Design a binder for this molecule. Structure first.
Ligand SMILES: CCCCCCCCCCCCCCCC(=O)O[C@H](COC(=O)CCCCCCCC[C@H](C)CCCCCCCC)COP(=O)(O)O
Ligand SMILES: CCCCCCCCCCCCCCCC(=O)O[C@H](COC(=O)CCCCCCCC[C@H](C)CCCCCCCC)COP(=O)(O)O
Ligand SMILES: C=C/C(C)=C/[C@@]1(C)SC(=O)C(C(=O)C(F)(F)F)=C1O
Ligand SMILES: C=C/C(C)=C/[C@@]1(C)SC(=O)C(C(=O)C(F)(F)F)=C1O
Ligand SMILES: [K+]
Ligand SMILES: [K+]
Lengths: 414, 414
């Protein structure tokens, strides 16, 4: 029975990470902010909020907007998730030391929730106003949801496959799972993986608001996202994109890269319960966690830390507490980063996987913000108030998505 | 190292297929039609053609529209690709004998090019006319590109993962590739897999036309799609969707399912060349074919048949001919079904995978339509004029996608 622990799968390490967030464009600065209790969530100052008088008037825009780094041709030839992909792909490579790798052993797996959807609406308006010849010859390649992964693949020269798993809010973690499978199956030795997502805009706010999923605590934006708290009232948008570089331990050693963590195993399951509510019992979600432990070669008692999906809906957080119990991981120290960074949909599982790596690298879990009144249906060890220090040696990052998708990633200290 | 031939992977069999096409809603009648030299391509009668005076006036709508099978509630609460996926998933399951399987060992993998995009422009229009509270509460779950796979997962009860790989025109084959991986890695014993795609409409025609990729042979619609022909001048749309049921041979035998064929291995690579032109040398595309043979345990000398992606662009077919040579597969009999069925984008690799399976089951390849003047740069054995009967044992199905994606599937006669 192959596991990582028993040498049945090659050892896979994380050797570089990059992310842009509502706190900082610099992941090390985001991480210092989080440990200091900073939130990226503010009053939205966009004119679209007053134009439409939106019920939701809070969110975290990126600290450093993607397009301040894009030249004239990038703005007219890529959709926004493609520009974010290019920006992060170059940062990651530079952070990695700009390695010269074998392109034929180099894969890219990048998830996103939707793709270049603004170009859909642009092409629709252009054609309605001026006919079919007003549609750009670039529209197809900007719009297609594999667009961002493909821009990264072209940019960095990856020829062992470029893949885009889409599973709504779990896409960013699912991508890192498929990258790990591609390596252990022997299709690649090195992979860039993670997730990108669009910015906060009026139409996405309108659509999730009609699901009654979003916090409307507009008077205290930094207090609004309260995962696992008794007084939680839904999620808050917080923009992000994140990528990491993973490679076999052999490949990293040959080029002198210092690992940040190990990526030990991944589990994907599905609920077959409901399209937009997680099964309350957490059973299939718990089993995604268990399967990541089986592939890693770990037991539940090994898991020191869980990085919760923790969206701060009443229903979502209760199902996830039940899933953590099913997996036997409810004595782990838990963090819910959406408390501070909000929800970035297709990117967020990637961002939170990067945070999980940093917890293992640095031996610390940031405080979950706004965690003030424990909820008795949630009987979890939620880290709050101040950071929790410790010699953490194994952690699980959870992500789930509309459609019933459950993804868990098992990481270890290097 | 593990292969199907050496027993390192479990044996995986195809036990049911379903597809709706421009020739027939019934895959067995599609197949009889193809063998009789029928084309599904006609003059488009839609009012949108004359409204916009589109340069392209030809293509193949489904013989039997998806929505002649849909209630008005489904029409309001699913996107088109979800409706297609629900229709096909129920037909497939019925064809399989409505098996009772273990939901926790049952996965769904279904690709699509874009997703529920008509609900994006609908939501946009609604909000522009009446504000954010006019957007449907179901809009997110109809729009998300994992929506179709998730509908099928919920309909059929799949709890071992629901996955949507997006790779533009290769998505449908890539979905069968990941379903095969999901079974051989031990995450599932049974999977529903394939591709769905939306119908021909004005804005998709405008966007692909503006790339100068489409045939405009409007006076002779059935003669327009000419893969590998010297006078080819671009692709023709032909609607489709297709799913197959795959399962371990053990699982099939246990429920008394007769296999249609064996699914032996899958190879996925990428070009890192250009976003919308394939690499002219065919090298990475050929290595996708080679990887599928490695995993099957086959050599190129074993291959009897290649089902070509064969879009009928000048550069596309030339690059694929080079690919087949790189893989050592250029002595095989080649069929290009887009000649008769046209291009259905995210569904097409699934449709052509089902055709490959029927070639192997029945020992016959349909004629490539319109193949009249051999092109010296192609130098392939293109089956043409009449169906070719033979004792086919091993076949490769090729699909490629914008972004530089290459997918090959190796199938065997059962
Ligand atoms: C991280 C939190 C946010 C997550 C939100 C994720 C939602 C999906 C991502 C959508 C991508 C949007 C990209 C925006 C690019 C941009 O900025 O376009 C502005 C101007 O506005 C626009 O064009 C808005 C056009 C809207 C595009 C259609 C969005 C449809 C959303 C659906 C109705 C609801 C969400 C579906 C989500 C499904 C997947 C996840 C479950 C440039 O402005 P200017 O320079 O022209 O002045
Ligand atoms: C097989 C060939 C086709 C392949 C085409 C693939 C393109 C993707 C298809 C997307 C889904 C289309 C579903 C249409 C639903 C339908 O039928 O709605 C009509 C009324 O028109 C409409 O609303 C058209 C709505 C337009 C939707 C936006 C399409 C944007 C397309 C992009 C600009 C260009 C294509 C990008 C593809 C990228 C991915 C693949 C590389 C019935 O009207 P009614 O009488 O029922 O009221
Ligand atoms: C099957 C539905 C699932 C997994 C829904 C979850 C918990 S996953 C997710 O991100 C999410 C949210 O965004 C929401 F709606 F705010 F809670 C959810 O409601
Ligand atoms: C990287 C670009 C690729 C693989 C383009 C291909 C050959 S894949 C594909 O389906 C396709 C077409 O549909 C087109 F445009 F008709 F030729 C192509 O142009
Ligand atoms: K998480
Ligand atoms: K093919």
């Amino acid at each position: 029975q192959p596991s990582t622990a028993n040498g049945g799968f090659p050892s896979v390490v994380v050797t570089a990470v990059t992310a842009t967030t509502s706190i900082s464009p610099d992941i090390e600065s985001t991480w210092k902010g989080l440990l200091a209790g900073e939130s990226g969530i503010h009053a939205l100052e966009d004119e679209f909020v007053t134009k439409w008088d939106l019920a939701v008037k809070i969110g975290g825009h990126l600290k450093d907007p993607v397009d301040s780094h894009m030249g004239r041709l990038d703005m007219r030839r890529m959709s926004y998730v493609q520009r974010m992909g290019k920006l992060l792909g170059g940062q990651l490579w530079e952070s990695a030391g700009s390695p010269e790798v074998d392109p034929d052993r180099f894969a890219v797996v990048v998830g996103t929730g939707l793709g270049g959807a603004e170009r859909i609406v642009e092409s629709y308006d252009l054609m309605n106003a001026g006919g079919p010849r007003k549609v750009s010859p670039l529209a197809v390649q900007m719009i297609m949801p594999n667009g961002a992964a493909a821009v990264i693949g072209l940019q960095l020269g990856a020829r062992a496959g470029v893949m885009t798993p889409v599973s709504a809010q779990s896409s960013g973690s699912e991508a890192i799972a498929h990258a790990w499978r591609q390596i252990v199956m022997g299709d690649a030795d090195v992979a860039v993986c993670g997730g990108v997502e669009g910015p906060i805009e009026a139409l996405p706010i309108a659509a999730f608001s009609m699901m009654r999923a979003m916090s409307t605590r507009n008077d205290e934006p930094e207090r609004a996202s309260r995962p696992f708290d008794k007084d939680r009232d839904g999620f808050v948008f917080g923009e992000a994109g994140a990528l990491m570089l993973i490679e076999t331990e052999e490949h990293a050693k040959a080029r002198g890269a210092k690992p940040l963590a190990r990526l030990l195993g991944a589990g994907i399951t599905s609920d077959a319960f409901h399209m937009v509510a997680p099964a309350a019992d957490g059973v299939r979600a718990g089993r995604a966690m268990t399967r990541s432990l089986e592939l890693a070669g770990l037991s539940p008692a090994d898991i020191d830390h869980v990085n919760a999906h923790g969206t701060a809906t009443p229903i979502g957080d209760a199902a996830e507490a039940n899933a953590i119990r099913v997996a036997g991981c409810d004595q782990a120290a838990v963090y819910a980063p959406k408390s501070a960074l909000g929800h970035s949909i297709g990117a967020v599982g990637a961002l939170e996987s990067v945070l999980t790596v940093l917890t293992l690298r640095d031996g610390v879990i940031p405080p979950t913000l706004n965690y003030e009144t424990p909820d008795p249906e949630i009987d979890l060890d939620v880290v709050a108030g101040e950071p929790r220090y410790g010699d953490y040696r194994y952690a699980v990052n959870n992500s789930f998505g509309f459609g019933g998708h459950n993804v868990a990633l098992a990481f270890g200290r290097y």
